[PDB]
Design a protein around this ligand. Structure first.
Ligand SMILES: NC(=O)C1=CN([C@@H]2O[C@H](COP(=O)(O)OP(=O)(O)OC[C@H]3O[C@@H](n4cnc5c(N)ncnc54)[C@H](OP(=O)(O)O)[C@@H]3O)[C@@H](O)[C@H]2O)C=CC1
Ligand SMILES: NC(=O)C1=CN([C@@H]2O[C@H](COP(=O)(O)OP(=O)(O)OC[C@H]3O[C@@H](n4cnc5c(N)ncnc54)[C@H](OP(=O)(O)O)[C@@H]3O)[C@@H](O)[C@H]2O)C=CC1
Ligand SMILES: CCc1nc(N)nc(N)c1OCCCOc1ccc(-c2ccc(C(=O)O)cc2)cc1
Ligand SMILES: CCc1nc(N)nc(N)c1OCCCOc1ccc(-c2ccc(C(=O)O)cc2)cc1
Ligand SMILES: O=c1ccn([C@H]2C[C@H](O)[C@@H](COP(=O)(O)O)O2)c(=O)[nH]1
Ligand SMILES: O=c1ccn([C@H]2C[C@H](O)[C@@H](COP(=O)(O)O)O2)c(=O)[nH]1
Lengths: 523, 520
């Protein structure tokens, strides 16, 4: 038996990023303190997390623990152990830590130096002796760095409850580099915002009549993917990070997808009908299991809003997303023989500002032709917010054959409650490997832009997938990415002075604290 | 009590019996005909039966033997008690029931396979044996006496949703004595739908981690005891629970928001339901629905018609209020004729982009006949991801009596099977959504049959999803009813083109429903 399993010795900590195309890894989050105190101002959500974890006890589990500890030697409360510097960093009004047995490591200080109800120990060996004497549920080590360092060395930590604070601060002490061979992550929380920073919470691990009725009801339960190839992914117990909506859908298509061929001849695994929900109040859902850029997708969004159908505008900003859909060859295969190269026809922008107008060419002045659906939906959100008709539709059935291609992004519906704006986007055809990471980004940004110019706060972006597919040529790359653990998402900042939907320029957009795995050629 | 000690359960299978009509649990009361099962063999029940009555977990046995012994003042398998008729009705290749300890109650039979002469001599035999649980397999006599003498802990009741000729019945089950704890998925086997219900007599390192991850989880003007029955179920796998869970969720967490009429709703945003059309026809059973009107509307759509009068003369009144002089004047359609709803569903599916004149004009070959198009795609290019049928014509909205609630259908074809997604921008959960599920379910079948495919899944995506405040008391009654197995839909198989269906070509079979609820 290990000492730490007998006595249930855990560590808990919160690490931020520290100062300097960078590389990220687990060691990115390592900043513990600065000049005796915490690097940040009080982040509330971490404090509530730390108290809940350090105060929680289950009495009906004590019995088996009392036995286990008895066996090894022959209201219930947890124990918390702090280094002396750590103890001094805590405000007086929080001392001793409430509903917990406070223990302090020190040489320079003795029991006579403290007014408070606390145990003083001068060595770690004496902590084990004390734990041996006391009635307690679990034992949490609270730092600081020197304390952490020596409890990791001595192999005394069964699990690390680790908060990733997704900001940079000035630091002077640091959590030890964890060894992947000693400890591996088994669990990852939802992402949250608190005090103007995103954060998440991860757990590192050291390396009943009605039950039968369940089995009964399951009496009636393909693709050559080796489960082993998802070792890390399948090892995780709690996959609550919202990036798992995407990754889990990939997994589901790999294991249960249907083999079909598409135009190209590649073939896909396909399924039909999924929903993802992302909370933009708490994070910007830019994937972290691989590197993604946003310059292009913002430039496309702005080109849409201006009503444009001219491919050259994008090419001249060196955005190439629509290049291949504009070649002589592509247009000719679409039978658009009388269409100039890079004239993509009555696509997104045109439908958003001019639905129902007769498309001529990409240079025409279509002012006051068609329905300016973008304007109308901005008006509805402002003046008729409970309308269930706030919908913006790119799929104009009449003009489909005159488009370079039909829209994948069929419609956005909007929802307003309590000064907050949510968005449903319905996607008829979803390339999971390449297209969807970008598409989540695009409509998440657009939710912010619409939200802001209508004086609402963004709430939820909801992505409804119809035909959802993984290309075969993407499978190996997705296998890799599925075995990566997401980092906390970044945030998106918009210039607040931009008060009309048409007045945004690329420099009005900032992505902050993007932490991500390495870039991936899906091919 | 004895049945707790010795874990004596019943397991049975009951069909409907040949005689408005009323339905309740008693409807499912038929066990046998002429010493044989009333049905020709139903496989899923056989596989359920077997798997229920052979399943054992050896890790749980200590407790059982412990209790048993304390009470008697003292390769694991189950016990299976049969009546004599029961035992003989079984063909020989199935006797003795493999892998189970076979007991026969008889007053005439003569003694591995035990014989018992009266009931009390089971409890003796149980006190002597090692076994997991004890299953009473019938027949009627056995059930009766085991039941009247409180010797049954749970009933595993297979509800066979079809009518057969029967001479012997299951006892009535007293809703004071027993109540349903669980209901399974619905399935199709041997040309019948069926479900399984359960009557009940009336590393924890990761366990802490779950609590921690819940440290932030915290409107309800509704009450617990309001949903006693709903909340006291353990397994709710009946697909009717897709609808009802959504209502529950709106009633619990919905946003208070007021609509144009000043009625008030609770609304939420973004739901999916999925119904397997291969196994059933999802016509809500926790209340009565009628289908003639909604089929006629579907036929009106396909003909491409915009004339409210066509429906009104067949007494379908779905669109009546949207066609009044008042309702169009308010829509600023002063130059539109009463019951001329303008360029709605029909017009958009058959003439999208045509200039709408009036409901009597001749539109042949005007606009895009997208229904023809999607049907051609299904037939000739089934892997296209462009098979959508869109009613949301941004150009025509203002000229419609009202914008479509059913924005679009997307189709998908794999291995000779068709699935359909319908996206609905606005979902009146109490009144509209039940009819809407039926409507797009039938259409899915209609499209599939005319393209030589089998229907697979209907998938229903709710946008703005809401419950009217005057519906709440009725949805309360409705949540505490327990679904029955769904019916099936039959289309006249002769019909091979989407435009050749008539009202007579649709038959609902075996619709077992609770009593109609007046939504107000
Ligand atoms: N972000 C987070 O999650 C946390 C941050 N912190 C931060 O960390 C910093 C404090 O960490 P750090 O500087 O490493 O100081 P520590 O809190 O690790 O304290 C070290 C001191 O504790 C005593 N001590 C440690 N180990 C032993 C031992 N084996 N036997 C006897 N006495 C021992 C000694 O006290 P003495 O000198 O009196 O002999 C020693 O100098 C602060 O900036 C604090 O805010 C702290 C905890 C958690
Ligand atoms: N769908 C379902 O769930 C099931 C249906 N069935 C069907 O049920 C029918 C059989 O039911 P049923 O006709 O009632 O016949 P049973 O199977 O109930 O047989 C009854 C006989 O069992 C013996 N017995 C019953 N009670 C006692 C007692 N207290 N003490 C001693 N012996 C007793 C007697 O045989 P004796 O003459 O020896 O005294 C009695 O006549 C068949 O049609 C069969 O196919 C069969 C299994 C379950
Ligand atoms: C950061 C907490 C934390 N979280 C995780 N996840 N793990 C840990 N080991 C951990 O530290 C625990 C030991 C230190 O405890 C402190 C420290 C500071 C305060 C404080 C309160 C108010 C102000 C203010 O408002 O000025 C400032 C500081 C309260 C408790
Ligand atoms: C119906 C099963 C069942 N289910 C539930 N849920 N509860 C029960 N109590 C229960 O039956 C109890 C005794 C089962 O006994 C059998 C076994 C086999 C056959 C049989 C008949 C015809 C063929 C054929 O024609 O091939 C094959 C097999 C008939 C009766
Ligand atoms: O904005 C877009 C455009 C295209 N695609 C992908 C999905 C398909 O793999 C392909 C287009 O499919 P169809 O046009 O055949 O549906 O491009 C996207 O994911 N997003
Ligand atoms: O087939 C139909 C027709 C109407 N509605 C309901 C949804 C809304 O309660 C209302 C439509 O009103 P607006 O959403 O257009 O305001 O009618 C349905 O659910 N199904």
């Amino acid at each position: 038996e290990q000492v730490c399993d007998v006595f249930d010795i855990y560590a808990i900590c919160a690490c931020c990023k520290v100062e300097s195309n960078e590389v990220f890894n687990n060691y990115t989050f390592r900043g513990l303190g600065n000049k005796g105190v915490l690097p940040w101002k009080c982040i509330s959500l971490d404090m509530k997390y730390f108290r809940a974890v350090t105060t929680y006890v289950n009495e009906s589990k004590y019995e088996k623990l009392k036995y286990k500890r008895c066996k090894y030697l022959n209201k219930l409360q947890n124990v918390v152990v702090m280094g002396r510097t750590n103890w001094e960093s805590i405000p007086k009004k929080f001392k001793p830590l409430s509903n917990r047995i406070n223990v302090i490591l020190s040489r320079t200080l003795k029991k006579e130096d403290f007014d408070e109800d606390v145990y003083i120990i001068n060595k770690v060996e004496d902590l084990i002796v004390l734990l041996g004497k006391l009635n307690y549920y679990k034992c949490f080590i609270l730092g600081g760095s020197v304390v952490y360092q020596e409890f990791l060395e001595k192999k005394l930590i069964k699990k690390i409850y680790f908060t990733r604070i997704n900001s940079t601060y000035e630091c002077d002490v640091f959590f030890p580099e964890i060894n992947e061979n000693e400890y591996q992550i088994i669990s990852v929380s939802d992402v949250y915002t608190s005090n103007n920073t995103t954060l998440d919470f991860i757990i590192y691990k050291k390396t009943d009549e009605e039950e039968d009725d369940f089995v009964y009801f399951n009496f009636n339960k393909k693709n050559s993917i080796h489960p082993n190839d998802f070792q890390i992914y399948n090892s995780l117990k709690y996959k609550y990070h919202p990036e798992y909506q995407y990754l889990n859908i990939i997994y589901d298509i790999m294991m249960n997808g249907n083999k079909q061929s598409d135009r190209t001849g590649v073939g896909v695994l396909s399924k039909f009908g999924y929903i993802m929900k992302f909370d933009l109040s708490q994070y910007f859902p830019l994937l972290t299991t691989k590197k993604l850029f946003l310059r292009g997708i913002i430039e496309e969004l702005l080109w849409f809003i201006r009503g444009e159908t001219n491919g050259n505008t994008l090419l001249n900003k060196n955005v190439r997303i629509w290049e291949a859909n504009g070649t002589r060859e592509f247009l000719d295969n679409r039978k658009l023989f009388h269409r100039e190269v890079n004239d993509l026809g009555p696509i997104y922008g045109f439908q958003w500002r001019h639905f129902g107008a007769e498309y001529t060419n990409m240079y025409d002045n279509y002012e006051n032709k068609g329905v300016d659906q973008l304007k109308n939906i901005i008006n509805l959100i402002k003046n008729d917010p409970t309308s269930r008709r706030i919908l913006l539709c790119a799929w104009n059935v009449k003009d489909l054959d005159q488009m370079a291609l039909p829209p994948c992004h069929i419609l956005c519906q909007f929802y307003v409650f309590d000064g907050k704006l949510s968005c449903i986007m319905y996607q008829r055809s979803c390339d999971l490997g390449l297209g969807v990471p970008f598409n989540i980004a695009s409509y998440s940004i657009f939710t912010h832009m619409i939200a802001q110019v209508c004086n609402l706060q963004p709430a939820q972006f909801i992505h409804v997938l119809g035909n959802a597919h993984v290309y075969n040529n993407h499978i190996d790359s997705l296998k890799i990415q599925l075995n990566r653990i997401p980092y906390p998402f970044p945030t998106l900042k918009l210039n607040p002075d931009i008060k009309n939907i048409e007045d945004f320029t690329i420099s009005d957009f900032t992505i902050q604290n993007y932490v991500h795995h390495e870039k991936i050629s899906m091919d």
